Amino acid sequence: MILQALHGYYQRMSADPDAGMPPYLCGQCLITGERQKPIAQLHPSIKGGRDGVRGAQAVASIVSFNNTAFESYGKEQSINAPVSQEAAFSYVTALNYLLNPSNRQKVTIADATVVFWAERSSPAEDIFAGMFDPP
RNA sequence: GGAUUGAAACGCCAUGCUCAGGCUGGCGAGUGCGCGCCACUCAUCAAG
């Protein structure tokens, strides 16, 4: 799932008037499964550093095909991972929102930074921060 | 015999724990303490 779950999280948070943000060839999107949608050539970047993934570059990303060895079936750049532009923006925005330390849904474990959330509003979201790292 | 988001893909090159430093200086097992008090080898049996 993963990318689809971030998309669903954006859908959930974007509905609320607060604690979120509403901002907005053809193919089939692998995130939503919708057919005939404008595929994205290049996904918006994901924050690195203090407000993002610790140890990564400021403009890190999840989907990238910057070298030829990573390209298959004659596809160029992110066309190798066909996802509609709106879905790409939504999942990137959700991941960035979770990566913001101001929101209490982030924890760093050695090399990796862990972000967690629930399918619906629940007190577990603010509780689990202590489970993985008790005070 | 066209296609297993496949086909190809080193964590890899190299790096003294070393230089050294008494467990030593010295301290009676010692002062003393009967194996000793008694007790028949003895009552017999030619030499051939």
XYZ file of all heavy atoms in Angstrom, chain A residues 51 97-106:
94
model
N 13.465 19.306 9.250
C 12.032 19.207 9.011
C 11.673 18.057 8.082
O 10.542 18.000 7.588
C 11.497 20.524 8.450
C 10.750 21.332 9.490
O 11.090 21.225 10.687
O 9.815 22.067 9.111
N 3.787 16.687 5.493
C 3.041 17.081 6.680
C 3.421 16.216 7.873
O 3.645 16.722 8.978
C 1.542 16.984 6.399
C 0.664 17.426 7.545
C 0.158 18.714 7.597
C 0.333 16.549 8.567
C -0.648 19.120 8.640
C -0.471 16.946 9.614
C -0.959 18.233 9.646
O -1.762 18.634 10.687
N 3.501 14.901 7.666
C 3.910 14.020 8.752
C 5.359 14.261 9.147
O 5.701 14.166 10.329
C 3.706 12.562 8.353
C 2.247 12.112 8.298
C 2.099 10.890 7.415
C 1.731 11.830 9.694
N 6.221 14.572 8.177
C 7.631 14.782 8.475
C 7.876 16.053 9.275
O 8.968 16.219 9.826
C 8.439 14.828 7.179
C 8.727 13.480 6.521
C 9.313 13.680 5.137
C 9.669 12.657 7.380
N 6.903 16.947 9.349
C 7.079 18.176 10.110
C 7.088 17.855 11.599
O 6.093 17.326 12.112
C 5.960 19.160 9.784
C 6.162 20.512 10.435
O 6.929 20.651 11.385
N 5.466 21.520 9.925
N 8.163 18.157 12.334
C 8.184 17.825 13.766
C 7.128 18.553 14.577
O 6.799 18.092 15.678
C 9.598 18.231 14.200
C 10.012 19.260 13.221
C 9.390 18.859 11.920
N 6.587 19.666 14.076
C 5.533 20.358 14.807
C 4.340 19.447 15.045
O 3.784 19.428 16.149
C 5.099 21.609 14.044
O 4.093 22.309 14.752
N 3.932 18.690 14.031
C 2.953 17.633 14.226
C 3.602 16.507 15.018
O 4.704 16.060 14.686
C 2.449 17.116 12.880
C 1.850 18.212 12.026
O 2.475 18.687 11.079
N 0.631 18.620 12.356
N 2.927 16.050 16.064
C 3.507 15.062 16.972
C 3.359 13.637 16.460
O 2.856 12.765 17.172
C 2.879 15.207 18.357
C 2.583 16.647 18.790
C 3.851 17.424 19.136
N 4.784 16.669 19.964
C 4.521 16.217 21.184
N 3.365 16.460 21.780
N 5.446 15.508 21.826
N 3.794 13.375 15.227
C 3.690 12.059 14.612
C 4.985 11.676 13.902
O 4.965 11.238 12.752
C 2.513 12.015 13.643
C 1.165 12.101 14.330
C 0.010 11.997 13.363
O -0.780 11.056 13.419
N -0.100 12.971 12.470
N 6.117 11.841 14.580
C 7.423 11.595 13.991
C 8.392 11.171 15.082
O 8.333 11.678 16.204
C 7.942 12.850 13.279
C 9.289 12.694 12.603
C 9.768 14.024 12.050
C 11.085 13.885 11.313
N 11.618 15.203 10.878
